[PDB]
Amino acid sequence: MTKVLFVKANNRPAEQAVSVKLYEAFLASYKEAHPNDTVVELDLYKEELPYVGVDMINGTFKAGKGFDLTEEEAKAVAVADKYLNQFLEADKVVFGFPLWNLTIPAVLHTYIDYLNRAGKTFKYTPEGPVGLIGDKKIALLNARGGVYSEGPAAEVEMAVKYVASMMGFFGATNMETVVIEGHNQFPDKAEEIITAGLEEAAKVANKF
Amino acid sequence: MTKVLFVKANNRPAEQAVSVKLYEAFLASYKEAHPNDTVVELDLYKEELPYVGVDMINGTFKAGKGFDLTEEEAKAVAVADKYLNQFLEADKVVFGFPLWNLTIPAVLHTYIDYLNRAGKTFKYTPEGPVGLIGDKKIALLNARGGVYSEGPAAEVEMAVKYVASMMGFFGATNMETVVIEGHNQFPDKAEEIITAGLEEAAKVANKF
Ligand SMILES: [Cl-]
Ligand SMILES: [Cl-]
Secondary structure (H helix, E strand, O other): OOEEEEEEOOOOOOOOOHHHHHHHHHHHHHHHHOOOOEEEEEEHHHOOOOOOOHHHHHHHHHHHHOOOOOHHHHHHHHHHHHHHHHHHHOOEEEEEEEOEOOEOOHHHHHHHHHHOOEOOOEEOOOOOOEEOOOOOEEEEEEEEOOOOOOOOOHHHOEOHHHHHHHHHHOOOOOOEEEEEEOOOOOHHHHHHHHHHHHHHHHHHHHHO | OOEEEEEEOOOOOOOOOHHHHHHHHHHHHHHHHOOOOEEEEEEHHHOOOOOOOHHHHHHHHHHHHOOOOOHHHHHHHHHHHHHHHHHHHOOEEEEEEEOEOOEOOHHHHHHHHHHOOEOOOEEOOOOOOEEOOOOOEEEEEEEEOOOOOOOOOHHHOEOHHHHHHHHHHOOOOOOEEEEEEOOOOOHHHHHHHHHHHHHHHHHHHHHO
16 A cells, blocks of 8 residues: 655644644545555654754764664664654655744754665765655645745745755655645735635645 | 853764864853853753743743643743743853754754743734844854855755844844854865864954
């Protein structure tokens, strides 16, 4: 069966978080369109996500070489490996996140840090890195209260741009992006903006 | 006495991390120039930095209003408050960080998340937010192995740009930035690049 992983990075209620409403609608539409696919949800707010530091950096280096590790190094590699393996095994991955403080939630930042692994998501070559996830389909789902595609905030969008950039580095192509934006900044258009976004979400989900 | 806070976000050894070498040289130069200033180091890798989620978001909202909180909400606010208060009390703050995966370490991302607080680092007004840290001097110290000021990576620098953007939102002005870049990409120039950077660090530190 096709394996689809949904990575959710917002534990606020749907009633208050358009990004969660977006995620839920895409999820529901995907399941309706493809009921035989094995869909798994990874809720990053239910996971233990130790931060990447020296133990995880040295650890992954040593692990890759088959060298001895401290217990703390081994534990760090094992955490990263769990998520990385699940991500690699997925045929399709859907990221659902808000824009908070110009970027993604720090939980998703740590998750992405785990996915960067030589020999797994990219490889070094004498002419530069080559991404290894070319076959994997990725969808990015973001809601943000202000507009970031134009105007004074356009140069500081670091949420979608962040995720897209790292996925591109890993070799992902033809990614789908659904953005709902502006509903808090233009409150009189909030209902229209979200409705349109949720319809877009269902269309994308049906082709994804 | 003037109060200076150094926020360190890299637990790799100086011998291997130019960003740590940079931080240490700026620190040493600052202390030599201003030995009577009270300098405190906050090493984010020694701190417990719970991620920002619904408890911390609801919690801070409720706290601000003087409303009742769950124990988990109260604990989240208290963590954020500890760091926020220390940051507010500092006359000067120095951030030392690498560029990893296009951005700052996730520990520093969570730290910055804590600093965003209505009534503390900014205020809402009927004509938009006004930053409240205009009097605070900020220095940003970054090292990165590749070049991000020009070339194919220039559009994806999200480490300095991230920190600068949030500090600017809080109302910081005339910030000092010291960047050492390119030493891994141009290894034959690594010694020259780092030496020049450490000299720049000492100059800035003497005026800071
Ligand atoms: Cl560590
Ligand atoms: Cl939470």
